[PDB]
Design a protein around this ligand. Structure first.
Ligand SMILES: CCCCCCCC/C=C/CCCCCCCC(=O)OC[C@@H](O)CO
Lengths: 28, 28, 28
């Protein structure tokens, strides 16, 4: 179950980076 | 503990995208 | 060990953000 929780953390970081990009476009 | 794990994973990706953007502005 | 679970979540989240930043960098 260790590797699966890593992908969850990796997928969450992938999601957070796109949120940072969408918030930037919201300003632009 | 599960909610905090996915939270800081999203915050890590949210924080990593901003630092990379500031690293990108350093080029140009 | 609730301390190191959060650290790997930060590492996994930062990993995901760098993935997306280089993933979107390919599209250009
Ligand atoms: C704890 C931090 C709180 C917010 C601090 C805000 C001030 C510092 C920086 C502000 C601007 C951040 C913008 C960040 C925008 C998201 C990153 C992005 O778009 O990357 C992809 C692009 O480079 C295109 O390939």
């Amino acid at each position: 179950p260790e590797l699966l929780f890593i992908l969850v953390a990796i997928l969450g970081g992938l999601f957070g980076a796109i949120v940072a990009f969408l918030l930037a476009l919201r300003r632009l």
